[PDB]
Structures are given as structure tokens and as C-alpha cells.
Design a protein around this motif. Structure first.
Motif, PDB file in Angstrom:
ATOM      1  N   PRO A 244      -6.812   6.155 -36.927  1.00  0.00           N
ATOM      2  CA  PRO A 244      -6.598   5.691 -38.295  1.00  0.00           C
ATOM      3  C   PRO A 244      -5.767   4.404 -38.355  1.00  0.00           C
ATOM      4  O   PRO A 244      -4.825   4.266 -37.581  1.00  0.00           O
ATOM      5  CB  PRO A 244      -5.781   6.842 -38.927  1.00  0.00           C
ATOM      6  N   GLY A 245      -6.119   3.522 -39.274  1.00  0.00           N
ATOM      7  CA  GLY A 245      -7.205   3.746 -40.217  1.00  0.00           C
ATOM      8  C   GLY A 245      -8.284   2.671 -40.042  1.00  0.00           C
ATOM      9  O   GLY A 245      -8.248   1.918 -39.089  1.00  0.00           O
ATOM     10  N   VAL A 246      -9.189   2.592 -41.016  1.00  0.00           N
ATOM     11  CA  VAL A 246     -10.286   1.607 -40.878  1.00  0.00           C
ATOM     12  C   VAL A 246     -11.004   1.757 -39.551  1.00  0.00           C
ATOM     13  O   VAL A 246     -10.969   0.962 -38.629  1.00  0.00           O
ATOM     14  CB  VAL A 246      -9.898   0.170 -41.275  1.00  0.00           C
TER      15      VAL A 246
END
Lengths: 10, 10, 10, 10
Positions: free
Chosen positions: B3-5
Motif C-alpha cells: 500500500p498504497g497505489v
DNA sequence: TAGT
DNA sequence: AGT
DNA sequence: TAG
DNA sequence: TAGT
DNA sequence: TAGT
DNA sequence: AGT
DNA sequence: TAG
DNA sequence: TAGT
């Protein structure tokens, strides 16, 4: 922060 | 993702 | 998926 | 079968 | 054999 | 076929 | 030896 | 990347 | 869907 | 999760 | 309606 | 206080 990890700030 | 994206996956 | 149509996941 | 598990038949 |  |  |  |  |  |  |  |  970021996003992620807004800004800061905004 | 990330995390993230986690990972992926996990 | 499924099966059929594993999981997700596993 | 189904599909799955076509039809049958077709 | 057919036919997600 | 069904990140 | 998927059904 | 996974596991009828 | 699992899982900063 | 990340004054 | 994050990815 | 804030704003993937």
C-alpha cells in the motif's frame, strides 16, 4: 500527506 | 497496490 | 472465481 | 454441462 | 462427441 | 472463462 | 482426471 | 500473483 | 476479492 | 495511514 | 467513486 | 484545521 503518505497540506 | 497505489496481491 | 465463474481468491 | 458443470447438449 |  |  |  |  |  |  |  |  500525499496522497498518499494531501500535502501537507491541502 | 502498495500500500498504497497490498502488492498486488496481499 | 468459484469454481466455476477459486474464490477470489483461492 | 452448463457451461459449465454447453447444456448439455450444445 | 456435440459445445465457463 | 474467471487487481 | 471438469462437466 | 492466486487457483470447474 | 484476498490485502497506506 | 498520514502542528 | 483509490489501488 | 487541512484534504490515494
Amino acid at each position: 500527506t500525499x496522497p498518499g503518505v494531501t500535502x501537507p497540506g491541502v
